[model samples]
Target: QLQARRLDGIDYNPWVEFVKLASEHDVVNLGQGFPDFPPPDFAVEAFQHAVSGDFMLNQYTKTFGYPPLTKILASFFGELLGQEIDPLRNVLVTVGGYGALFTAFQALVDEGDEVIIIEPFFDCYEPMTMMAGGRPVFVSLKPGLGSSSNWQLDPMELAGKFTSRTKALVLNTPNNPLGKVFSREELELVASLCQQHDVVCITDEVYQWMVYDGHQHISIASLPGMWERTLTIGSAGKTFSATGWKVGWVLGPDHIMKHLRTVHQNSVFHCPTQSQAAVAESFEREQLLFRQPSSYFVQFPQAMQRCRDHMIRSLQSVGLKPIIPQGSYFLITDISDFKRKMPDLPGAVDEPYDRRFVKWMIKNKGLVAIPVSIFYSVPHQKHFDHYIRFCFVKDEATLQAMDEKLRKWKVEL
Candidate 1:
């Protein structure tokens, strides 16, 4: 008998190889999408208290979630979504935002079912869908209004991607790779399609609070007739700058969330207790500060905007033009200008240009960033390969180091 394989078709992960290349050259890492800064004191102190003061918290938490965290999330997001939420019925605390997405795919998707994915996505959705025995159909977001300003989705083109086989649509707001925040008008358009086709919307709102330039984030689940058909995902790691926290949750109708609970229970029965205890306290504090000027939700983005601006200045000083993002802490720059100096590897000369440039930069310049092409579908890879994504969620010392690296490069050029 032949061996069964669902993962052999999975795309190669460049970071696996690139990380080694980066270390060999002693490169400053900006490759991964995590903050180099420590988490907020409020959250850290909470964790300290959980570990030190409480003996009970040292034990395992509730299988679905820690009791306090799930309840508070219901109350917190209930207000935001304009509907009451039931903690036990509507929520599932997962390992991270990643686990929340994984549960959604594994729970709902079946063989031959189709999932529409937006191009330049988070890069994990394609593989996850394949593992769940689902076919991923991709539609790319195009630059419509301005040069890299408003990456718009054409509703007519997007509408055509749906059919009876359509099971779900993945939407990431303040989208990664390209920092285009989905507008209320756009969400409504997508909502209209989901209603007609009876499709579920797996909305990843992990970067929900990481918006900038006065751009507002609109959740597709908030629209009428859409809440029933959407599973909204969020992250504590992203919110508190504590990515290592590995705490995330999903909100949806009971009928839908029940299946995810099945997937989660069969897997990791319960997350670590201390971290969940800490996150529960953090959310409790956030409730008091919600929408206020002094809220970490407000202050975090303000600080990130400064980092984003600093990166803009650094990139411009080096003649690397940046697509000024309206939201999210990510910005991608065109790298076509540096390819003449960036040579190809022997026998792999005909390979994609962006990959070669990113690898070479990591080795030579000691600055690491992810290739933008890795975020796109294969057929659309070359059309976008001239760009590279840079994470601005870094510490000042790290930003300064990156700036210094770019400044030195400017002199060398």
Candidate 2:
């Protein structure tokens, strides 16, 4: 009763529920999106160096971001985004990609404002929009067979969602759960709509470095007439595989960032100091080796592509139809064939099929994956019950174990 009314009906957390379920059983957890391996040695050592080198690295550096980190980010993303970026004016560093997203929504989305979000989105987008008093207007990426590229957004349907009350559009390239990197043509179409409707575009490029099979990640902010109306977010955690660090940044024009700065300044103003220092060092090293074979940017994707391919083979061998992802650590699979192998358990009358199937898969098969329906809105969840999401960013041993389990399960079937 003491809690704010806004917290109503938002208390359920699927991550916590599924993670707890996995922890209780002897399962190979591929449910969440974190990697099972350690971060690059250089990133770890950078943090070690920061802890031992300077006493000042432990104190507050800047409200928006540390000086060194923001400077490098401005220089790095400035070249990529094809414009000059003022670190002070254009960047707002927050706790993580989650925090950056929250700040953007809170700062820009007024009550009753409609925020357009694609369905099968990173689950936080809807809650963040609602918590900021904005109305979430959703459009789905219609699913299809083959690669995740097949999950396409209907252009006319997307355009239809943009009414006068529309204030913002959230785009995630190398999107989580689906791992479909938004094509350049798709981005151009969305950009044109945002431009036409005078809407701000918030692009989440956290998995920016994980594209595979020659598919490129295009930032909508780089599109024509989009710079002033875009807020681009990046994650240090995803970039360096150090998610626990909880560091992320937002890049955009001064006017929009100015308000984000206000929201940030009033809440969670300073991010962790030492973590920022380490991230700054990590990026500095990457800047020098940018595009070179030795750069983590080059090596990380190559390694993950191998993992993705291995996972595809393993899943298909067991009769599950895997939709090969072009980017990100996740890939969704069709579990329709497995429905006969595992029927719904008791006391799950209202539960979606994928959720029950995933729970059974964990209990009976010793494997864990997220039901794809959880990523959809309540009304859309039932339509996606035949799919589940798995994370491929695991260690070699973990992958081998998962493969063995699937192979053995296939034999049993």
Candidate 3:
């Protein structure tokens, strides 16, 4: 039952479905990847301060982005990437990272054009490509030893994937699901391949500030000659822990950005005014606080690293082999060892086992997680079906409750 497009007629998202069931059962949810914590105090204060002004909320600012916001973002990101970014020409604030992605695809990808997407990617890339009339060409990041630290992309395989048909490559570093941060050498390999194929690069870096254990994020556009061809996207929602704010941006050279502005104007028209003002304040504050040890950007990765360690230990005790994440808030574990406890359904032997396992674990064991295989295309499903992803971004009490549930469930297993 294939539809015209790859993403059409797909099952309702397992996470959303299971989240409802888990809530009904009063189960602790570790499934979805939203932070269970509040945004920084400064961000909250900034929003309140901005809203108190009588004139701020009454009008729409720029169609592309608020002027003050774009200038702050340009300066902030420019400092991080070590480039002199022009606010007017380089930055366009969008509704969110998702909006930025949609704009990039519509602007750059033409009908029948091909875009390379890494496997176990953030789930939106495939559908976003399909909607833009682009064919998604996938390449898997093979897992290796020692948690997710070893999930590496083969340069040879990557080089082979790029051809005259390849229009762009979607790169997510400090990646979701596996949480592997791409090394400098790895970015160089991708940059070289893009140069060789003359392809556009769309880099999703929403998790840029979330790298762990002294690992720094390297922007692909920061590489020599790569900036001209790269569209770097980021989220202020993720940045400030205010996902509801729905503010994000795209930065690139004027040549590429002109088309993106066309897509932005035609579709979303403008981002939220007050949210942009709040985000601008955040960027300004971050400049003074970024180097300090108490910086939210600094402390967040540290906190998440602790959570990651706790999660890895918790999963391991229950017989799941967890792949430790180097960055981001996710950790993946193989449930292949738990096949003995998982029940079989009629006519479901060949289905991705992890998906079924997650449902069973939630309904019976009352623990929830996302199946890693859901991030892959059908052809690559079997290869990654043994793993399930867990988010470690919850507070201590929430994680403790999950630990208590797992402790008891392990006895049954």
Candidate achieving the largest TM-score:
2
lDDT of model 3 at position 409 = 85
For residues 85-104, what per-residue lDDT tens digits would candidate 1 score against the true structure? 99999999998999999999
Residue lDDT tens for model 2, 1-413: 89987765677788878879877776788886899899999999999998998898877888889999999999999999997999999988899999999999989998899999998989999988888888888899987648899998999899999999999999999898899999889999998999899999999999999999989888888888899999999999999999999999999999899999999989987888899999999999999999999999999999999999999998887788998899998999998877656655543666888998887788878899999988888888877778999999999999998987898788877
Off by over 4 Å in 1: 1-3, 145-149, 339-350
Off by over 4 Å in 3: 1-15, 340-350
The better candidate by TM-score, 1 or 2, is: 2
For 46-76, candidate 3 gives per-residue lDDT tens digits of 8987787758565888998889898888888
lDDT of 3 at 39: 88
Distance from true location, Cα of 271 in model 1, Å: 1.5
lDDT pick, better of 1 and 3: 1
Q: Which predicted model would earn the best lDDT?
A: 2
lDDT-better candidate, 1 vs 2 = 2
